[PDB]
Amino acid sequence: GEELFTGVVPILVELDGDVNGHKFSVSGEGEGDATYGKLTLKFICTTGKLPVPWPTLVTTLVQCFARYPDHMKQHDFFKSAMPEGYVQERTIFFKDDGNYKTRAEVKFEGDTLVNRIELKGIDFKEDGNILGHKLEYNAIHGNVYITADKQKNGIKANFGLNCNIEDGSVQLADHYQQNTPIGDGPVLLPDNHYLSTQSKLSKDPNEKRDHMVLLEFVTAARMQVADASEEELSECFRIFDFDGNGFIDREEFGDIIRLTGEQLTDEDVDEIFGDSDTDKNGRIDFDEFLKMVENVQPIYPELMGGVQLADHYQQNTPIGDGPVLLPDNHYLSYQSKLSKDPNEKRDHMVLLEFVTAAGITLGSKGEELFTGVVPILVELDGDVNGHKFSVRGEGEGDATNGKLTLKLICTTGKLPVPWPTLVTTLLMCFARYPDHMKQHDFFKSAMPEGYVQERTIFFKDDGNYKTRAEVKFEGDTLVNRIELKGIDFKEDGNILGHKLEYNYNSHFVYITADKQKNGIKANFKIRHNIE
Ligand SMILES: [Ca+2]
Ligand SMILES: [Ca+2]
């Protein structure tokens, strides 16, 4: 292997595509600067209008221009295969839509680096997010997780790539990648690492054709525990250890490891657990966790990278004196979707929550009010660092499917904090408890007359929220009335400086009884993505 990438290199890109019978060609040109991990490319659809969104093609349309730091040069397969080049193949699975299969040759032709690609797409929905042009033209980013494939003399890569849908929600594209060298000469076969990639999409004002301008940065990295503080490694362990007992069990690992990506089978999970549990005692201690972080490269970058932790401490008490169910220990699995009503002019959040109860092995009263689609009202008054605001919401809850849908409006103008920081504050009564767990649903048992739900939320390296809510029925409407006080926030921090992404991760909320207050309590870590 040799470095023809020491300076600036001219790039050509040619793609021929067919997605659901819709043919198209793309031609691009630009420059690559590997020493700074930089590309600049202008891409043109030569066949008129592109039948798919430009952001779906970014990854298909030259990773040999990655910046490999000096301590990682021995892991750069891409450059080592030059000038003869490599074959890059992918299958890209769009969530709830079709897939692309791609085959590219990336090689030198003279002193120009050329990417020649054929792409075939199938099973797309003609008015899906892809063929219906429903994605935003923003920016994409992600980590490309590389492992050696010694059998083919090359590498594999996987990564989930997110792209914003026009309604503010997120489209997932699951990438499976292979690279093999075109020639016979030696190549570097790397230890597990990843490419940290940020893509900037824009337009030329002077270009009439359907096109994309791309500025892109690609940097090689490898997670090492030596490069994180005790604090950070402890935080990361605690994401896994969500029952707070100091050790990671199999159920926990299964739950949390699947938040690092969508591409692990039940067997892959069993394997990682077995490999990490080096003393075979059925649990991952902290020393074992530290090895597991280096061996399974996605863990720290996906759970902790670019994340703002919010530590929640919660307590729920019945308003009534009627008897309630106090549960054995268990947890709630939360998935959340954030979107925008395109006809609401005020600052607002549409929130969809999926919530199921789990974590009791296998071996009513105010249930009934939830049989039952139930209308919800939400009222919050807030004060964060002296900044007052009110939120008013309405929607529906469906406990039989663990589903709720809410539209929330800031009635005082512009919300002085990001909507995602209020998601947890703005209805655990709409969780679906399995039939073997119905005796553990405190939340429904307190209805009709309801419960108080208090929290303290600690934003790491920033201020905290304190909340008090009453959740009760008034007639046939379920009402959540909340006061929120926030203090000690930094005016240029991630909260008051609005540097949190408009999306939401999945979480497991461990619930325990609090018999002395005749209720339940819970503490859990929320993970807000930064930017
Ligand atoms: Ca544990
Ligand atoms: Ca162990």
Numbering used by the authors: 5 to 65, 69 to 370, 385 to 447, 451 to 555
Please give the exact wording used by the authors of the publication that reports this structure.
Here, we report the high-resolution x-ray structure of the fluorescent proteins mCerulean3 and cpVenus within the biosensor Twitch-2B, as they undergo FRET and characterize the dynamics of this biosensor with B02-dependent paramagnetic nuclear magnetic resonance at 900 MHz and 1.1 GHz.
We speculated that replacing those interactions by hydrophobic contacts would rigidify the linkers and increase the experimental FRET efficiency. Toward this goal, we designed the mutation N532F on the surface of cpVenuscd, creating a new interaction with F249 of the calcium-binding domain.
